[PDB]
Design a binder for this molecule. Structure first.
Ligand code: GE5
Length: 287
């Protein structure tokens, strides 16, 4: 109930992230926002976490408020991110681990969409494993770029818009995001498709391109994504990864994705491969 701030561990969408301690009991994670910021957002994000509360893989917020020069949000401590675990696993995941992760990540995105929001920054850093009895559970974090895509009462979808600035991480952004189109449900899922192929490959082919300014930088990434057919991107990997991406790329702006179809693709592959659904990930094998 009273919190000690520890080392800074990084930065979220709109603030810095810290390890901390609840001195009376337990270790926590703490996000800070300057209270004098011109674009306050931490309390908005807190309310989204609250709307999401109780979902599988949705982190619990312990306290939000103001102290000194900061707005403060305290979260239950979670385990390593999927990017951290990727590094710990020598930047290679077995097919079994990719498929286990795919099943849960699709479900996390579906859940957020069911609560009327799109995430808009699907990337490995925003998925964290739980701890203790939740160690086999993938959590999704960070609603700082999240947006409501439909009305809570009528479910009327937001309108189509063009010439929008790229929101999120360029590496995993959808093609339509690069082309300036308003993001919708389909784009969260397309980004996940790039995340899965990133886990398969160790890098994506639009990493490390040269340019002068950040504007051109994103342009080069856009051009490489558009000019790399899915069959080339996914060459040498099971067809399901291409099928997944083609499905996502083919969705209409306001389509409700068939999340079950996408999970079934990978589940059927998992079964054909003879894998056991025992939640044993590559990092559980580290000695
Ligand atoms: C017990 O021994 C340990 C040993 C080493 C450790 O690590 C060095 C740890 C710490 C594990 C940990 O990170 N746990 C954690 C993190 C968060 C995050 S992570 C994030 N952004 N990450 C990125 C990454 C890349 C790019 C952008 C952002 N934001 C929030 C967050 C969000 C809201 C909030 F209120 C508080 C925190 C939430 C809960 N647990 C432990």
């Amino acid at each position: 109930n009273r919190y000690r701030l520890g080392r800074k561990i990084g930065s979220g969408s709109f603030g810095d992230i810290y390890l901390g301690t609840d001195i009376a009991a337990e270790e926590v994670a703490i996000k800070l926002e300057c209270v004098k910021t011109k674009h306050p957002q931490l309390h908005i994000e807190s309310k989204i976490y609250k709307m999401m509360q109780g979902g599988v893989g949705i982190p619990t917020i312990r306290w939000c408020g103001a102290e000194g020069d900061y707005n403060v949000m305290v979260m239950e401590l979670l385990g390593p991110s999927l990017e951290d675990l990727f590094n710990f696993c020598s930047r290679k995941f077995s097919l079994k681990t990719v498929l286990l992760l795919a099943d849960q990540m699709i479900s996390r995105i579906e859940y957020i969409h069911s609560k009327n929001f799109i995430h808009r920054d699907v990337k490995p850093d925003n998925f964290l494993m739980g701890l203790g009895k939740k160690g086999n559970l993938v959590y999704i974090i960070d609603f700082g770029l999240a947006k409501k895509y439909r009305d809570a009462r009528t479910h009327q979808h937001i309108p189509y818009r063009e010439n929008k600035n790229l929101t999120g991480t360029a590496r995993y952004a959808s093609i339509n995001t690069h082309l300036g189109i308003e993001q919708s449900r389909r784009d969260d899922l397309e980004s996940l498709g790039y995340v899965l192929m990133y886990f398969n490959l160790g890098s994506l082919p639009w990493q490390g391109l040269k340019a002068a300014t950040k504007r051109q930088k994103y342009e080069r990434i856009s051009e490489k994504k558009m000019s790399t057919p899915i069959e080339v991107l996914c060459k040498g990997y099971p067809s399901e990864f291409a099928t997944y991406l083609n499905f996502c790329r083919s969705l209409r702006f306001d389509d409700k994705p068939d999340y079950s179809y996408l999970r079934q693709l990978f589940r059927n592959l998992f079964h054909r491969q003879g894998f056991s659904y025992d939640y044993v990930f590559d990092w559980n094998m580290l000695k």
